[PDB]
């Protein structure tokens, strides 16, 4: 560690593992001094870290420290550059040569020969710099982050551009580009040679020489012709009409053009040689982009035409997935950086490459639950595995057991008679003590009763070790069901394991009269929420609710004693990007303040997510031969109609 | 030189672009392992004879063994190769990068810019996109052919079979053995002995669930190949070491890595791995051995493939093509239309109607399909070469474009051609005798297809069952509580499925269906279930489609198709997607589709 404690820093030498030493991996942010100008982008990064689940206020507990000084822009000529930063960071008591420090940086270098002049001496801190060259990138230490402007959304999302997936996966043009060319300096070599390849039919490469205020002095013969054609085409309309969007190198290796290319669904053909692509340690960029060498600039159209239709289809879908998962907002970027850091501590608890490069993505797949891909409801097709044929019933009881006619008893035996059930868990969250053992009716499957330590609605979504099946049938105390209904719901779940399969569908909407989201429970022609009161879902969503969600939302849920099912559906629709499944015609599965709390919850969840992840759907999965004029001796699920 | 990456060190003027995206390798005119490596490279497609057209140069010098290297002489020979040119695009293979004075975890030759493919790489001596980490080939992999033991429970849980480990490692392992006992089988000094008890060294590794791999020197041991061959999940406790072919192989699914300092807690780490994950890791270890660790030929081919993927990133082979075992590959899916996007209702669908001597009923199809609000374009495939389409005045007046396409041949595959005249994503392939479908039913089918645009949303309900008596598949068409097929009499599906039928259907299924003029819908459903990996979605309770030797042919069709695919890609479901608020006590006006009933 003494030999390589410098530019050759790695996570196993220039990083103290003993500070985390537990399942708690926390990140600490230094206080702000109320005397320094702060750019809005670094403030957004700081707010995203502070609002995260990795944030703690105790420097002793945390094992990752974030500076409050603005290190985003290190260009001395930039208006957001902060002077006297070396002495200002060396005077920090917690610096410790920057041992567990993450430094966010977006720009570096002055006018002549732009380089990685970060300004101060970073020491041992890993820098999450934006435009990192390959030879200046520490592989298992640094994180290559995208270059984003100050207008990048804090928590929302542009939601991509590809709303049609039509074959053949080609558009009007094949390669497009419209940006400035620099007649003096470094980094315009690849931009001054685009007229060679420009043809005007499908390869449209537009440039303008107007840079700064003295561009007229150094102009040449070619600039007059090129500048005339510049106004012919609109840049936003151009990226949306090309199968591939050229993303060359400007002054620095990276550019805003990469993220716009990913968003516009056009597969980026990066011509920035020696650019460590954003999050390259976890993302395979051969699946979402074409990497073109700068030396072979003339052969680019040929290599582009050689790409087959299937490859183009895959590339477009993959770039859209990467945008929607990791690069959509600043919170996405910082959470991705923190999780990439986290995966490097406990090696046996990490996300395999199939997790990062596939739906739903690494943000929503937490290895602390299980590193086995079959323990998740998303990777059944990628393996040769079928959904498990057994499920565990969890009953949330809040009323005491006073009479044998209570609905919690008839429901417990109802789930037992099903051929798929493995066991039953009765979460007893009542003020009265636990009922007698003989009070539980005899069942084929074992019955386990757990008395909740904290009688809050978030306890019903805890990852209990007593659940031995990947599937969970979550029922309330007042849930009325038949064995046939449970069997049908589980069989339907077996085709859609990543969703929530349940009876009570509820919908959401936007109320323009109040400019806020609205919760609807009436019979509507469409739905986007099926409540957890009677629904089947993978048990990984329990871990997701327990850990991924912020403490504030769960605390509010506990305080109001409501909105647990709404939040669960929010999380499921966010992870899956698919609407939930409602089964059968069951309109009521039971038997003014509630609605207001639910609507406030919906608005709060939308504010935290930055958008509405719930997706409408106007179909339900009913049994074949349901209410069909056939002899009743042929149907399988006879009792559903009854 | 560590500051040597592809974008600067490599000379891409030598291999710009080829119609076949395979780089060319030249070999200049010696241990037997290197002879085998050169033979493997020579017989591959990468081999070329013209020096000018080559992109990679592999010298015919033994660099795998460094204990008898004579580094000065080897460096002088590398310079003397007369084509070194500062090692711009040369490749060197190594397996023992260490020195008796000190082990640098890299080759000690100058190698100013040459590509290195060495067994032992630390994260400091490794260039990310430049060098390739190769396995340390074990002669035991081919010298003794261990029986292919099936995955399952083993006599021992954790095991360690290494000779001459560091005393700290031995102390930690003995502490674990005395703390647990009868499970941690630490072995000492081609036979291993615990305490007066002898195990067969290659075959004892088959008696354990997890296997311990440590670092004594060169940072990479030959025991990894033996552990992979025996099937046990390897545990690597080298602090700073990258597993071979880590660029393309997913070792998180085939190994467990724990730091050297955190060795005393290895048992608690391993007990957190469920048994199913253990079986999967064992399968992946065996797959890695038979595909990459088996022979010097496999390692050489893997290295050349990785370097080719670096040179031509757009043509690199997939992750599944790298680390999915053949059983998994047969069971895998790799869905092409995977992006969870919901197409807007602003767009619509194109209706392909295949007609053959039903002119009176064909216009009924046109005026029934054209009434739906979301129809974009209507396409009629006139498959009869003896009767011309009626006069354009005879065609009915509709709100959407209608065009007719003449077919030079009479085939049932003419329904599934990717016509450039189709501009939308969805295709409503409907036969000429389908009239009973109302406008609302077709609109509901389209709406359900929007929520499920990667499947086959059909209105006919079919099934297939297994005939135990005859030991063969049996076509089914009776009204049953199980669906496996939806016929193309009314099917919403992606135009990519038309492309797949026309250009990618396996075997002679297209030819056979054209010859027998039957069973095109079955073939389409088979292809959709094979490529998408999930079953069809049947919509509506409607089952009848005719208002006013074939079946045995359908059974033969199913049997032949199952023979061609080698399995039954179809899946059985009970999904009859219906409109919500179906058959409820609700006003008819507010219902989305209040015209579904049969
Ligand atoms: C309880 C009660 O009163 N039930 C009545 C129903 O039984 C009755 O339905 C009848 O069921 C018959 C059946 O076996 O399902 C059905 O026979 C045929 O049904 C279809 C008629 O077209 C045939 O399906 C054809 O199969 C072809 C194929 O590819 O194999 C397709 O190409 C054709 O497009 C398709 O039409 C089916 O093969 C027939 N069955 C068999 C075993 O061959 C009777 O027609 C039907 O009457 C209904 C009718 O009103 O009433 C009650 O519900
Ligand atoms: C989708 O269709 C493809 C074929 O187009 C299926 O691949 C085929 O799957 C079968 C079933 O495993 C393979 O059969 C096996 O062959 C090996 C020898 O190759 C034999 O030893 C085994 O006993 C078994 O019979 C077949 O080889 C394979 N074909 C190819 C080219 O790989 C695939 O399984 C289908 N997928 C689904 C989900 O149905
Ligand atoms: O006509 C144009 C050219 C560029 N840009 C934006 O400018 C940025 C990069 O282009 P520019 O040439 O200004 O910078 P460079 O590419 O030279 O680094 C990106 O955000 C582009 O979206 C734009 O909006 N319109
Ligand atoms: O040589 C032929 C005969 C029929 N068809 C079409 O195939 C479909 C199936 O025919 P149908 O069910 O009407 O009768 P079948 O031939 O199947 O008994 C119809 O759309 C016919 O127009 C065809 O393409 N070629
Ligand atoms: C780019 O595509 C849009 C469709 O969104 C179209 O309106 C526009 O005309 C296209 N641009 C050109 C130059 O044709
Ligand atoms: Mn017919």
Q: Where are the domains of chain A?
A: 1-152+329-357, 173-325, 391-609
Strand order through the sheet with A173-180: A203-208, A173-180, A242-247, A267-270, A290-291
Topology, domain A391-609: Spore Coat Polysaccharide Biosynthesis Protein SpsA; Chain A (3.90.550)
Rounded-to-integer distance, Cα B121 and Cα A196, Å: 43
Residue found under tokens 């474009």: B401
Rounded-to-integer distance, Cα B96 and Cα B134, Å: 11
Check if the beta carbon of residue A290 is closer than 8 Å to that of residue A307: yes
- Can you give the length of chain B in residues? 598
- Supply A408's token pair: 């919690």
- Closest partner residue to A372 among B13, B274, B338, by Cβ? B274
Strand partners, B26: B57
Contacts of B44-52 with CB under 8 Å at 24 or more apart are: B44/B300, B44/B301, B44/B304, B45/B20, B46/B22, B46/B304, B46/B308, B48/B24, B50/B26, B51/B26, B51/B83
* Cβ neighbours of residue B11 closer than 8 Å, sequence gap 6 or more: B88, B89
Half-sphere CA count of A459, side-chain side, radius 13 A: 19
Phi-psi region of A377 (alpha: psi -120 to 50; beta: other; left: phi over 0): alpha
In ligand 1, the atom with minimum distance to the C-alpha of B543 is 20
For residue A625, the SS3 value is: coil
- Supply B589's token pair: 């006006």
Nearest residue (by CA) to ligand 2, atom 25, is B566
DSSP string, A290-310: EE--STT-TTHHHHHHTS-HH
| Ligand 1 pocket, mutate which of B354, B432, B477 (most atoms under 8 A from CB) | B477
Strand spans (E) along B208-248: 208-213, 233-236
Rounded-to-integer distance, Cα A398 and Cα A598, Å: 20
Could you give the angle at the alpha carbon of B504 between the alpha carbons of B378 and B338, nearest 5°? 75
Strand order through the sheet with B537-539: A619-622, B576-579, B537-539, B456-458, B490-494, B426-431, B349-355, B375-382, B402-406
Check if the beta carbon of residue B222 is closer than 8 Å to that of residue B123: no
* Cβ neighbours of residue A506 closer than 8 Å, sequence gap 6 or more: A519, A520, A521, A527, A528, A529, A530, A531
Instruction: From B135, B139, B136, B118, select the one nearest B127 (Cα to Cα).
Output: B118
In ligand 4, the atom with minimum distance to the C-alpha of B353 is 20
For helices B296-311 and B32-42, the axis angle rounded to 10 degrees is 50
- Closest partner residue to A630 among B333, B340, B479, by Cβ? B479
Looking only at the bridges linking them, the beta strands covering A505-511 and A529-530 are: antiparallel
Distance A525 CA to ligand 1 centre (A): 32
Check if the beta carbon of residue A387 is closer than 8 Å to that of residue A497: yes
Residue found under tokens 């608005």: A603
* Cβ neighbours of residue B70 closer than 8 Å, sequence gap 6 or more: none
A624·B481 Cβ contact <8 A: yes
- Can you give the length of chain A in residues? 642
Rounded-to-integer distance, Cα A116 and Cα A122, Å: 12
For residue A619, the SS3 value is: strand
- Buried residues in B514-541 as b, exposed as e (16+ CB within 10 A): beeebbbbbbbbbbbbbbbbbbbbbbbb
* Cβ neighbours of residue A434 closer than 8 Å, sequence gap 6 or more: A428, A449, A451
Strand order through the sheet with A505-511: A516-520, A505-511, A529-530
For residue A598, the SS3 value is: helix
Do the first three CATH levels of A173-325 and A391-609 match, i.e. the same topology?
no
Alpha helices in B217-295 (DSSP H): 223-230, 266-271, 275-288
Rounded-to-integer distance, Cα A188 and Cα A185, Å: 7
- Please give the backbone phi and psi of residue B384, each rounded to the nearest 5 degrees, phi first: -100, 120
Widest distance between CA atoms in chain A: 96
Rounded-to-integer distance, Cα B140 and Cα B30, Å: 21
Alpha helices in A527-592 (DSSP H): 540-543, 551-560, 564-576
* Cβ neighbours of residue A534 closer than 8 Å, sequence gap 6 or more: A474, A475, A476, A479, A481, A502, A503, A504, A586, A589
Q: Is A526 on the interface with B (CB under 8 A)?
A: yes
Consecutive H or E run containing B429 = strand B426-431
Q: What is the dihedral of CA A603, A606, A608, A613, to 10 degrees?
A: 160
Check if the beta carbon of residue A591 is closer than 8 Å to that of residue A601: no
> Does B358 appear as a known binding residue?
yes
B481·A625 Cβ contact <8 A: yes
Rounded-to-integer distance, Cα A369 and Cα B90, Å: 45
Dihedral sign computed on CA atoms, order A614, A617, A622, A627: positive
For helices B509-516 and B520-532, the axis angle rounded to 10 degrees is 160
Instruction: From B291, B299, B278, select the one nearest B329 (Cα to Cα).
Output: B291
- Supply B540's token pair: 């509506």
For residue A570, the SS3 value is: helix
Rounded-to-integer distance, Cα B401 and Cα B398, Å: 7
Burial class (CB in 10 A: 0-12, 13-18, 19+), A86: exposed
Check if the beta carbon of residue B518 is closer than 8 Å to that of residue B485: no
| DSSP 8-state class, residue A267 | E
Rounded-to-integer distance, Cα B341 and Cα B253, Å: 30
For residue A593, the SS3 value is: helix
Strand spans (E) along B319-417: 349-355, 375-382, 402-406
- Please give the backbone phi and psi of residue B191, each rounded to the nearest 5 degrees, phi first: -130, 150
DSSP string, A139-162: TTT--------TTS-SS-----S-
Distance A374 CA to ligand 2 centre (A): 22
Rounded-to-integer distance, Cα B487 and Cα B492, Å: 10
Check if the beta carbon of residue B158 is closer than 8 Å to that of residue B176: yes
For residue A243, the SS3 value is: strand
The alpha carbon of A207 is separated from its chain's Cα centroid by a whole number of angstroms, namely 36
* Cβ neighbours of residue B490 closer than 8 Å, sequence gap 6 or more: B428, B429, B430, B431, B434, B437, B442, B445, B458, B459, B460, B545
Check if the beta carbon of residue A565 is closer than 8 Å to that of residue A531: yes
Could you give the angle at the alpha carbon of A214 between the alpha carbons of A211 and A220, nearest 5°? 80
Check if the beta carbon of residue A266 is closer than 8 Å to that of residue A245: yes
* Cβ neighbours of residue B32 closer than 8 Å, sequence gap 6 or more: none
DSSP string, A37-89: ---HHHHHHHHHHHTSTTEES-TTT-S-EE-SS--SB--TTSTT--SS-HHHH
Burial class (CB in 10 A: 0-12, 13-18, 19+), B575: buried
* Cβ neighbours of residue A634 closer than 8 Å, sequence gap 6 or more: A625, B479, B480, B481
Cα–Cα distances in angstroms (integers) from residue B405 to residues A167, A301, B201, B410, B429, in the given order: 20, 34, 71, 13, 15
Rounded-to-integer distance, Cα B438 and Cα B459, Å: 12
Cβ–ligand 2 contact at B330 (below 6 Å): yes
Q: Is B589 on the interface with A (CB under 8 A)?
A: no
Cα–Cα distances in angstroms (integers) from residue A300 to residues A164, A175, A290, B110, B254, in the given order: 27, 9, 10, 35, 38
Rounded-to-integer distance, Cα A116 and Cα A138, Å: 13
Rounded-to-integer distance, Cα A168 and Cα B423, Å: 10
Looking only at the bridges linking them, the beta strands covering B537-539 and B191-193 are: unpaired
Check if the beta carbon of residue B114 is closer than 8 Å to that of residue B92: yes
Rounded-to-integer distance, Cα B528 and Cα B510, Å: 14
DSSP string, A368-424: TT-S-GGGSTT-TTTTT-PPPS-EEEEEEE-S----TTSHHHHHHHHHHTSTTEEEE
Rounded-to-integer distance, Cα B579 and Cα B594, Å: 9
Check if the beta carbon of residue A332 is closer than 8 Å to that of residue A363: yes
Alpha helices in B272-346 (DSSP H): 275-288, 296-311, 320-323, 326-331
Dihedral sign computed on CA atoms, order A502, A492, A389, A496: negative
Cα–Cα distances in angstroms (integers) from residue B557 to residues A409, B455, B512, B513, in the given order: 52, 22, 9, 9
* Domain A173-325 -> CATH class: alpha beta
Rounded-to-integer distance, Cα B136 and Cα A263, Å: 43
Residue found under tokens 């067969």: B200
Check if the beta carbon of residue B596 is closer than 8 Å to that of residue B444: yes
Instruction: From A457, A453, A491, select the one nearest A473 (Cα to Cα).
Output: A491
Cβ–ligand 2 contact at B569 (below 6 Å): yes
| Ligand 4 pocket, mutate which of B431, B477, B545 (most atoms under 8 A from CB) | B431
Strand partners, A162: none
CA closest to B597 among chain A residues: A628
Could you give the angle at the alpha carbon of A443 between the alpha carbons of A440 and A449, nearest 5°? 45
Burial class (CB in 10 A: 0-12, 13-18, 19+), A225: exposed
- Please give the backbone phi and psi of residue A311, each rounded to the nearest 5 degrees, phi first: -60, -40
DSSP string, A437-493: GGGSPP-SS-EEEEE-SS-SGGGGGS--TT--SSEEEEEETT----HHHHHHHHHHH
- Supply A447's token pair: 């019955």
How many other C-beta atoms can be found within 10 angstroms of the C-beta atom of residue A316?
A: 21
Dihedral sign computed on CA atoms, order A461, A463, A465, A467: positive
Check if the beta carbon of residue B300 is closer than 8 Å to that of residue B259: no
Residue found under tokens 């080719």: B308
Cα–Cα distances in angstroms (integers) from residue A316 to residues A267, A268, A276, A309, in the given order: 6, 9, 21, 11
Could you give the angle at the alpha carbon of B53 between the alpha carbons of B50 and B57, nearest 5°? 80
Instruction: From B27, B21, B62, B23, select the one nearest B41 (Cα to Cα).
Output: B27
Burial class (CB in 10 A: 0-12, 13-18, 19+), B148: exposed
Rounded-to-integer distance, Cα A287 and Cα A277, Å: 13
Could you give the angle at the alpha carbon of A107 between the alpha carbons of A103 and A113, nearest 5°? 125
Check if the beta carbon of residue A145 is closer than 8 Å to that of residue A329: no
Check if the beta carbon of residue A410 is closer than 8 Å to that of residue A391: no
Residue found under tokens 């593992």: A17
Rounded-to-integer distance, Cα A608 and Cα A431, Å: 33
Looking only at the bridges linking them, the beta strands covering A501-502 and A534-538 are: antiparallel
> Does B64 appear as a known binding residue?
no
Consecutive H or E run containing B554 = helix B550-565
Rounded-to-integer distance, Cα A261 and Cα A278, Å: 13
Residues whose beta carbon lies within 6 Å of some atom of ligand 1: A 629-631; B 477-479, 489, 545-546, 554
Strand order through the sheet with A421-428: A447-451, A421-428, A391-397, A471-476, A534-538, A501-502, A581-582
What is the radius of gyration, based on Cα positions, of chain A? 28
Cα–Cα distances in angstroms (integers) from residue A433 to residues A402, A412, A447, A477, B362, in the given order: 12, 19, 18, 17, 73
Q: Which residues have a beta carbon within 5 Å of ligand 6, which is an ion?
A: B 433
Could you give the angle at the alpha carbon of B297 between the alpha carbons of B291 and B302, nearest 5°? 55
Burial class (CB in 10 A: 0-12, 13-18, 19+), B12: middle
Resolution in A: 2.8
Cα–Cα distances in angstroms (integers) from residue B355 to residues B363, B379, B387, B411, B502, in the given order: 10, 11, 11, 12, 19
DSSP string, B32-62: HHHHHHHHHHHTSTTB-S-TTT-SEEE-SS-
Looking only at the bridges linking them, the beta strands covering B115-118 and B156-161 are: unpaired
Q: Which of residues 93-152 of A touch B (CB under 8 A)?
A: 134-135, 137, 139-140
């Amino acid at each position: 560690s003494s030999i390589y404690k410098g530019k050759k820093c790695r996570m196993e030498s220039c990083f103290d593992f003993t500070l985390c030493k537990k399942n708690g991996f926390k990140v600490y942010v230094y206080p702000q001094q109320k005397g320094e100008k702060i750019a809005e982008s670094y403030q957004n990064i700081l707010a995203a870290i502070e609002g995260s689940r990795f944030y703690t206020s105790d420097p002793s507990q945390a094992c990752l420290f974030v500076l409050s000084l603005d290190t985003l822009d290190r260009d001395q000529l930039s208006p957001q550059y902060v002077h006297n930063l070396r002495s200002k960071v060396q005077s920090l008591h917690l610096w410790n040569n920057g041992r567990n420090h993450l430094i966010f940086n977006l720009y570096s270098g002055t006018w002549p020969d732009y380089t990685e002049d970060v300004g101060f001496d970073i020491g041992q801190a890993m820098l999450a710099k934006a435009s990192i060259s390959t030879e200046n990138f520490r592989p298992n230490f640094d994180v290559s982050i995208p270059l984003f402007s100050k207008d990048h959304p804090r928590t929302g999302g542009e939601r991509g551009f590809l709303k049609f997936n039509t074959i053949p996966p080609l558009r009007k043009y094949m390669l497009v580009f419209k940006g400035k060319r620099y007649l003096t300096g470094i980094g315009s070599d690849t931009r001054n040679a685009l007229y060679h390849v420009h043809n005007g039919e499908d390869v449209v490469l537009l440039t303008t020489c107007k840079h700064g205020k003295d561009w007229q002095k150094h102009k040449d013969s070619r600039c007059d012709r090129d500048n005339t054609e510049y106004e012919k085409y609109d840049y936003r309309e151009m990226l949306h009409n090309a199968t591939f969007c050229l993303v060359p190198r400007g002054r620095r290796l990276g550019s805003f053009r990469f993220l716009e290319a990913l968003q516009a669904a056009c597969v980026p053909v990066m011509l920035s040689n020696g650019w460590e692509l954003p999050f390259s340690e976890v993302i395979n960029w051969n699946q979402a982009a074409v990497i073109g060498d700068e030396r072979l600039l003339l052969q680019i159209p040929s290599t582009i035409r050689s790409i087959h239709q299937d490859k183009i289809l895959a590339l477009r879908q993959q770039t859209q997935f990467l945008w929607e998962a990791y690069f959509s907002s600043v919170e996405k970027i910082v959470l991705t950086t923190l999780e990439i850091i986290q995966d490097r501590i406990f090696k046996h608890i990490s996300r395999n490459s199939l997790i990062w490069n596939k739906h739903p993505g690494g943000l929503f797949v937490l290895p602390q639950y299980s590193s086995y891909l079959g323990d998740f409801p998303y990777y059944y097709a990628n393996l040769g595995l079928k959904p498990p044929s057994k499920f565990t019933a969890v009953i949330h009881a809040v009323t005491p057991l006073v009479s044998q006619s209570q609905p919690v008893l008839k429901l417990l035996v109802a789930a037992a008679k099903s051929q798929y059930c493995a066991q039953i868990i009765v979460l007893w969250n009542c003020d009265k003590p636990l009922p007698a053992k003989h009070r539980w009716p005899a069942t084929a499957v074992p019955v386990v009763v757990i008395e909740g330590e904290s009688k809050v609605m978030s306890s019903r979504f805890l990852p209990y070790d007593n659940i031995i099946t990947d599937a969970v049938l979550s029922l309330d105390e007042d849930t009325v069901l038949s064995t046939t209904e449970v069997d049908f719901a589980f069989t339907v779940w077996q085709s859609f394991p990543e969703r929530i399969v349940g009876y009570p569908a509820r919908s959401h909407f936007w109320d323009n009269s109040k400019e806020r989201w609205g919760y609807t429970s009436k019979w509507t022609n469409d739905y986007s929420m099926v409540l957890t009161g009677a629904a089947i879902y993978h048990k990984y969503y329990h871990y997701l609710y327990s850990h991924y969600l912020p403490a504030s939302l769960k605390n509010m849920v506990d305080q109001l004693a409501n909105c647990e099912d709404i939040l669960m559906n929010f999380l499921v629709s966010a992870v899956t990007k698919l609407p939930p499944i409602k089964v059968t015609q069951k309109k009521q599965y039971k038997e003014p303040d509630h609605f207001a709390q639910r609507q406030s919850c919906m608005n709060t969840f939308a504010s935290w997510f930055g958008y509405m992840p719930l997706i409408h759907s106007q179909m339900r999965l009913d049994p074949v031969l349901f209410k069909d004029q056939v002899s009743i001796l042929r149907k399988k699920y006879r009792d559903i109609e009854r | 030189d560590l500051s040597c990456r592809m974008h600067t060190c490599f000379d891409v003027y030598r291999c710009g672009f080829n119609p076949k995206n395979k780089i060319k390798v030249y070999i200049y005119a010696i241990s037997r392992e290197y002879n085998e490596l050169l033979m493997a490279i020579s017989d591959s497609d990468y081999y070329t004879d013209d020096i000018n057209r080559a992109c990679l140069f592999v010298p015919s010098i033994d660099v795998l063994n460094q204990n008898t290297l004579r580094i000065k002489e080897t460096a002088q020979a590398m310079a003397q190769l007369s084509r070194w040119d500062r090692g711009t695009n040369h490749l060197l293979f190594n397996m023992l990068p260490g020195g008796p004075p000190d082990y640098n975890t890299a080759l000690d030759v100058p190698r100013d810019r040459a590509l290195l493919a060495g067994g032992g790489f630390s994260t400091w001596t490794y260039r990310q996109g430049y060098d390739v980490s190769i396995p340390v080939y074990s002669p035991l992999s081919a010298e003794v052919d261990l029986p292919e033991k099936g995955p399952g429970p083993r006599q021992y849980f954790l095991l360690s079979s290494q000779v001459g480990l560091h005393p700290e490692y031995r102390e930690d392992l003995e502490a674990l053995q005395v703390k647990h006992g009868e499970s941690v089988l630490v072995l000492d000094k081609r036979k291993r002995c615990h305490k007066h008890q002898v195990f067969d060294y290659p075959q004892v590794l088959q008696e354990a669930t997890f296997c311990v791999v440590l670092r004594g020197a060169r940072l990479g041991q030959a025991v990894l190949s033996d552990v992979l061959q025996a099937g046990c999940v390897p545990v690597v406790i080298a602090d700073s070491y990258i597993l071979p072919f880590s660029e393309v192989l997913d070792w998180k699914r085939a190994s467990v890595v724990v730091p050297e300092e955190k060795m005393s807690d290895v048992y608690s780490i391993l007990q957190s791995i469920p048994q199913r994950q253990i079986e999967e890791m064992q399968r992946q270890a065996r797959w890695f051995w038979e595909a990459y660790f088996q022979s010097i030929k496999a390692i050489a081919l893997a290295t050349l493939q990785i370097i080719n993927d670096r040179i031509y990133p757009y043509a690199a082979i997939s992750y599944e093509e790298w680390n999915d075992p053949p059983a998994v590959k047969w069971g895998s899916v790799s869905n092409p239309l995977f992006l969870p996007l919901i197409p807007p209702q602003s767009q619509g669908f194109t209706a392909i109607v295949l007609t053959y001597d039903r002119v009176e009923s064909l216009f009924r199809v046109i005026t029934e399909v054209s009434k739906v609000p979301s129809l974009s374009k209507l396409l009629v495939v006139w498959n009869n070469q003896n009767k011309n389409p009626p006069e354009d005045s005879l065609w009915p007046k509709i709100r959407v474009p209608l065009k007719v396409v003449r077919t030079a041949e009479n085939k049932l595959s003419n329904r599934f051609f990717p016509y450039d005249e189709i501009e939308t994503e969805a295709v409503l392939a409907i036969d000429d005798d389908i009239i009973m479908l109302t406008s609302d039913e077709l609109q509901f089918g389209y709406e359900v297809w929007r929520e499920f645009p990667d499947r086959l949303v059909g209105y006919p309900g079919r099934l297939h069952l297994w005939d135990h008596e005859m030991n063969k598949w049996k076509y089914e068409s009776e009204w049953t509580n199980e669906v496996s097929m939806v016929l193309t009499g009314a099917a919403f599906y992606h135009k990519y499925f038309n492309y797949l039928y026309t250009y990618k259907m396996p075997g002679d299924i297209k030819n056979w269906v054209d010859a027998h003029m039957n069973c095109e819908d079955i073939a389409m459903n088979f292809l959709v279930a094979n490529v998408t990996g999930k079953a069809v979605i049947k919509v509506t309770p409607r089952k009848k489609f005719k208002c006013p030797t074939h079946m045995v042919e359908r059974s033969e069709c199913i049997n032949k198709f199952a023979s061609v695919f080698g399995t039954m890609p179809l899946k059985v479901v009970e999904h009859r997607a219906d409109p919500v608020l179906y058959k409820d006590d609700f006003p008819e006006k507010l219902k989305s589709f209040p015209n579904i009933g049969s």
